[PDB]
Design brief:
The PDB classes it as de novo protein. The structure is a homotrimer of 33-residue chains. The longest helix of chain A has 27 residues, at 2-28. Chain A is 82% helix and 0% strand. Chain A has one helix at 2-28. Chain A is built from one helix and no strands. With 33 residues, chain A is mainly α.
Chain lengths: 33, 33, 33
Amino acid sequence: EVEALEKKVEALEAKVQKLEKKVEALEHGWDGR
Amino acid sequence: EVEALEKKVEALEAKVQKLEKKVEALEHGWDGR
Amino acid sequence: EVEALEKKVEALEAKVQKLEKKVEALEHGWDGR
């Protein structure tokens, strides 16, 4: 498990980082969005 | 721990998938949103 | 690993909770957003 868990957590971290950026752009209205 | 960790990661994956869909709908403006 | 995994999952849970709130505010248009 622990190896599989490591991979899924790393996937999630990448996805959470991208969502934070997208949501921060939506909240601030960057680039006319 | 490892059993608890598995459950929380699975919860997070579901939540991250729903957030991606919602944010992709906000970014693309689907359905007048 | 398992200790490191616990910390990253906890970080992710906090971040996912904040994103849910922000996205729910964007979807519902709370506070004129």
